[PDB]
Symmetry: C2
Subunit: 190 residues, 2 copies
């Protein structure tokens, strides 16, 4: 089973990944995780990060260029993902293909049913061969709550996410809070 | 030996690569050739091509983004360029790192002393560790003649007549200062044998 954990930055994804992993193991299943972007593991991911820090000229000014960088990063992890999927019962990804769909649309002031989100599916899932996640778990957080733990882009990204999940973008979604009961979540995703 | 053929679009590089390839084979030197972008062999390349034809939203509008896809295309070809360099006496590349430096600077109305050229330098050679070619051969040609060759669809770069002229100008500067290594500037009527003899 392939599970993607999605949400805005500061939503609490890294932590929810561990908890959900802990719950699945307690239930007698093996679990491997992988996080994106794979900083330090792929040039695409490292250039994207740098671009976001004001490097590489006008690269960051292009929504589709940034999106492509994050996709090329995932493309280079296909062999890894396929490996984890053959060895472990559950593979949990800290951010996946929907992160590109959500942030790209938000930067373009589009919505989940827009072109950028449609484009992400055609590119990553079919052309690059990234496995479509069985479950996409949205750790939804309001703009207000996120602030506590780029606001406008972040807020709009949160909105695209809420809609992506409601529309079953790329598959079945589940919305949860950071406090969600690990054991109940694992049982629901079994 | 690694030789890179450079020039603007329609300059007639493809041909020169064939002719030079022959001269080398005649002189008893096995030759292999590779062209960039490696269409059909690199998703970065394929996407770059489609982006110049108006696809992938605002991709092509970023000078550095396009340069990056090409740089990433070549990076994923490092092992191959080395595999060729080992199995043949001469490797000929149809466009290489310099293409990226000339076009990127041209798109920015910059010259060889600009940031784009230096940026290309660091990321491709230094960071990505692309093998520096022993020879960079600039195939100079008339801007009028080159443009007509292409008019006879064309992507956003080919339709840009001023881009192609600035690209030629920057190219000449690159070769003139030995950007990235030793260059050789030739005309369309250059004799293959003579050139091959010179290069090797
Ligand atoms: C260490 C830790 C940080 N956080 C916070 C710090 C961040 N704000 C946020 C990290 O969110 P992301 O994992 O999606 O980057 O959660 C938790 O919610 N739980 C934790 O156990
Ligand atoms: C993995 C991923 C991240 N991103 C974004 C969200 C983030 N924006 N900020 N700041 C940025 C870095 O995300 P991380 O903080 O999780 O590394 O890139 C995408 O746009 N698409 C993707 O596929
Ligand atoms: C290989 C390459 C092509 N290009 C450009 C020139 C062209 N416009 C376009 C395609 O060139 P070719 O037609 O030679 O494939 O991309 C660069 O700007 N940098 C590069 O490194």
């Amino acid at each position: 089973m392939l599970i993607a954990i999605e949400g805005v930055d500061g939503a609490g994804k890294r932590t929810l990944v561990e908890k959900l992993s802990g719950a699945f193991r307690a239930a007698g299943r093996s679990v491997a995780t992988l996080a994106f972007p794979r900083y330090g593991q792929s040039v695409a991911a490292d250039i994207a990060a740098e671009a976001l820090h004001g490097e590489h000229g006008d690269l960051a000014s292009s929504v589709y260029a940034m999106a492509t960088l994050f996709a090329l990063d995932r493309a280079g992890a296909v062999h890894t993902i396929q490996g984890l999927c053959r060895g472990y019962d559950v593979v949990i990804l800290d951010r996946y293909v929907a992160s590109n769909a959500a942030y790209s649309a938000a930067r373009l002031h589009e919505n989940a049913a827009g072109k950028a989100a449609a484009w992400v599916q055609r590119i990553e899932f079919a052309r690059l061969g990234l496995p479509k996640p069985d479950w996409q778990v949205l750790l939804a957080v309001s703009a207000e709550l996120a602030g506590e733990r780029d606001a406008e882009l972040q807020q709009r990204t949160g909105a695209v996410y809420a809609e992506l999940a409601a529309q079953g973008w790329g598959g079945r979604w589940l919305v949860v809070g950071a406090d969600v009961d690990p054991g109940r979540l694992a049982a629901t995703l079994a």
